[PDB]
A paper describes a structure:
SARS-CoV-2 Mpro is a functional homodimer of two symmetrically disposed protomers that are each 306 residues in length (33.8 kDa). Using C-terminally substituted Mpro chimeras, we have determined X-ray crystallographic structures of Mpro in complex with 10 of its 11 viral cleavage sites, bound at full occupancy intermolecularly in trans, within the active site of either the native enzyme and/or a catalytic mutant (C145A).
For cleavage site C12, in which we have captured complexes within both native and C145A active sites, crystals belong to space group P21 with 12 protomers in the ASU, four of which create dimers with bound active site complexes. In the C12 PHTVLQ WT structure, the ~2.3 Å resolution map showed the clear presence of a covalent acyl-enzyme intermediate. Given the nature of the C-terminal product-like complexes here, observation of an intermolecular covalent link between catalytic Cys145 and Gln306 from a different Mpro homodimer demonstrates that this reaction has occurred in reverse from product to acyl enzyme states. For the acyl-enzyme intermediate, the thioester bond formed between the Cys145 γ-sulfur atom and the carbonyl carbon of P1(Gln) creates a trigonal planar linkage group (defined by atoms Cα, C, and O of Gln306, and Sγ of Cys145), with Cys145 χ1 angles (defined by atoms N, Cα, Cβ, and Sγ) of ~ −70/−74ο, consistent with our previous observation for the C5 acyl-enzyme intermediate complex24 (−66ο).
Author numbering:
A (entry chain A), B (entry chain B): 1 to 302
Write the structure that this text describes.
Amino acid sequence: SGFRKMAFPSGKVEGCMVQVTCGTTTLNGLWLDDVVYCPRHVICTSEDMLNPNYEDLLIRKSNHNFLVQAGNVQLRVIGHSMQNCVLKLKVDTANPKTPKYKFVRIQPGQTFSVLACYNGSPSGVYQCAMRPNFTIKGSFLNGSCGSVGFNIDYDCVSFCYMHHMELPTGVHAGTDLEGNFYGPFVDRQTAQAAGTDTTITVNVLAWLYAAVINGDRWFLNRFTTTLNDFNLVAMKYNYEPLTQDHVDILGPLSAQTGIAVLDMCASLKELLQNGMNGRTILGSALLEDEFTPFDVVRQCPH
Amino acid sequence: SGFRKMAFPSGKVEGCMVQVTCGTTTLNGLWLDDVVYCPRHVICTSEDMLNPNYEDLLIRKSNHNFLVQAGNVQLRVIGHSMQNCVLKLKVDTANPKTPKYKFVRIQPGQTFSVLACYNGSPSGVYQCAMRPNFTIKGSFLNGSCGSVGFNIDYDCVSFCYMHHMELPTGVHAGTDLEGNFYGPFVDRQTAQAAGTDTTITVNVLAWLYAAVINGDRWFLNRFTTTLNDFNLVAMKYNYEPLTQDHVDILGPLSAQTGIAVLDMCASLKELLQNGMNGRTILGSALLEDEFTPFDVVRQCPH
Ligand code: NA
């Protein structure tokens, strides 16, 4: 038994992290086959970040301006090409440690694992969730730029995030591996702020189902609320509206526990209005919203 | 910025995970050099689990009774010996993925990364802390036996924990990599109970420091306390006594925050007395004690 926030094993991703340096800037890169993916602002100086024109900046750069190091093996940059907001540096050597991989764009409320890296060396791994406001509440320091977010499904790695910048509120923004930013964010130094974040309601319900599976049942009640009556309460507490698809997705968990989705919603409704009155759920004093219904099934097979 | 429970990169440990089968029992094993380490209860028969004599069970087993599989490759068992509660299987092949490693027995209050495994296949990685009662709060299901806990220092993997069983309360117990159990437990299916779980005080102080680094300062206070006066309050609320060494280890966090360790002690003393008053530190209504001072420094720019 037990339920913990779990990251995917990071071995397949570690073998693709290289150190990319351009000028006086150093960040991380993802080495897949003969291509190294890194954020395109590596070609930016500190003073150019105010209003960088990447088209001319990249064209003024030459191949030898890109110092790619895989550990201490120096990789020769054969070419550089713009990939939206990330760079595609071609190297002469394919990565022997290249795993079965795919580029996937996740939706808000979905989770993934982050392999935090500094100077091309992995430092830690944790689990994140794409917030409704298209940011992530990660742990990124200076030089973490280029750290990648991924999921793993049967030895196939689904890369979904690359870290680019930290927003003023401390949350972090980035792109998918195709170079397209999540949310309205752009890779320049402008007055940028994340929108008002909301709580992933379906994830909380999945987490509550995980608590019931593991024996934590004190929050259950005889009540059953309509989908709309729950949603009105949820809006007042900055919770995402629950959709019918969310109810459908929570179907397997409802069957495994024998508790109807709307019955569990009444439990969450009461929890929102009354609080946890000092009690804990799965060792937590807050309503966790970073476990997808899939994330629960993995840790709670039936 | 940002603070999260961060597990070490699991790549070096993934290469040592193998599947061990004995009779009808299958659990995970640790393949280092030409030796496979796994919990000795793999040789237990179904109805012998209540109170087994492993010396009998080992004499009833030969080398070819152990099925060891590293992925698709079957491993030949040359020898087998019992070291306390750990089964050592000698194989004809040294593991080519064996990293630099050592066997250490961590102290209570220390944290380590757990690589949860099933059928010799890693499935997730998360952070665990050795509770003062020598239990850990993890996510272990059937087949997770042999899942290992480790810390990484530079290129060296310090193996410190192998999972053996789950206590009735749902907490988890295991041994060091030499077969010696953490705490008073024995690998039998009896009614064992862990001791009373006190709170790791030095970890709470580090967590409060990690909060100050990440913005949360509401709990902060001007008055200070001596070590002995704080220890009296800590003893009342089942907190571990705070030694001078704990004060020294917290020094780096004090330097980054500009807050004396004894001043943070007074802020914790106030919190233990008047409680939360409905506020949160780092998104939690309770005090976290599963982050060591080293764990906080890893995520904070000193
Ligand atoms: Na209910």
